[PDB]
């Protein structure tokens, strides 16, 4: 079809199971994009449903702080999901470089992340894979806007109806209800937000172990703490929002809407 004719591939930005992400240029327009190239030669019925679901979810979400799908092009043996190019790299890189954010910078960051997650949930989308590697910066100038990316594991949910949608996500960011193999929905994203906000304030995660079984035990038990010295200067209201996000029971866990109204975000 029309990707081969209009677009030109350049360097790899990353690679997946049967997909690669490459910078491309829509030639006649002189505009650059990020092209997710999925290989479609002998895909299962399941794998086709997942591709159409990612495409559908990505078409659904129009928000300042969500990566925009430009186009979805079906060619023989290759599918192209074409997204606005985000040039400031992953949130992950920025945290490591700066070591941690100030509460002001951390608050502005998680505010934009929560406004993105709120929009997802209002549209019946659960990401399941929130982490600093899936948040991109609009530019390399400090205080640039963050953009939620990579909806490959995102699911569609019918209102607040939730269930066992299978084991998916990233170990350190997985919610307790996913590890217990219990019904789950929108709250798994707010648990991940809890992990991200903890990382933003002191520059390391609340759950870590070389042994994955032990990491999962710590997560299921909500066995995190706020050690000296890096927590010594942190406000209790910052610790409060983290606590309300890192709540084991998804019923009593703070929502995106509720978190956006937390004094630490709003009176600021």
């Amino acid at each position: 079809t029309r990707f081969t004719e209009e677009y030109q591939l350049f360097e790899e930005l990353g690679k997946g199971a049967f997909s690669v992400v490459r910078r491309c240029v829509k030639v006649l327009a002189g505009q650059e994009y990020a092209a997710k190239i999925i290989n479609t030669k002998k895909l299962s019925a399941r794998d086709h449903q997942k591709l159409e679901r990612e495409a559908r979810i990505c078409r659904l979400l129009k928000h300042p702080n969500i990566v925009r799908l430009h186009d979805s092009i079906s060619e023989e043996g290759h599918h192209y999901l074409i997204f606005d190019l985000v040039t400031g790299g992953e949130l992950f890189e920025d945290i490591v470089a700066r070591e941690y954010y100030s509460e002001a910078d951390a608050s502005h960051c998680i505010q934009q992340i929560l406004e993105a997650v709120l929009h997802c949930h209002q549209m019946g989308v659960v990401h399941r894979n929130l982490k600093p590697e899936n948040l991109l910066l609009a530019s390399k100038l400090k205080g640039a806007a963050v953009k939620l990316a990579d909806f490959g594991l995102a699911i569609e949910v019918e209102g607040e109806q939730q269930a066992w949608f299978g084991f998916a996500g990233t170990p350190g960011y997985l919610s307790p209800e996913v590890l217990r193999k219990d019904p789950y929905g929108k709250p798994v994203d707010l648990w991940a937000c809890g992990v991200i906000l903890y990382i933003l304030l002191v520059g390391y995660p609340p759950f870590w172990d070389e042994d994955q079984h032990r990491l999962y035990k710590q997560i299921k038990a909500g066995a995190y703490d706020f050690p000296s010295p890096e927590w010594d200067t942190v406000t209790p209201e910052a610790k409060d929002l983290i606590n309300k996000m890192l709540t084991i029971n998804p019923s009593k866990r703070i929502t995106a809407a509720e978190a956006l109204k937390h004094p630490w975000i709003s009176h600021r």
């Binding site: 199971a17 992950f92 945290i95 490591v96 894979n129 982490k131 600093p132 590697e133 490959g152 594991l153 299978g166 084991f167 998916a168 996500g169 990233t170 170990p171 350190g172 960011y173 990382i199 520059g203 390391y204 995660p205 609340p206 759950f207 870590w208 994955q212």
Partner: peptide, 14 residues
């Protein structure tokens, strides 16, 4: 001590 490291996604149990 806890460290900030890159982590790959899962699609099933490992």
């Amino acid at each position: 001590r806890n460290k900030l490291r890159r982590q790959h996604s899962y699609d099933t149990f490992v």
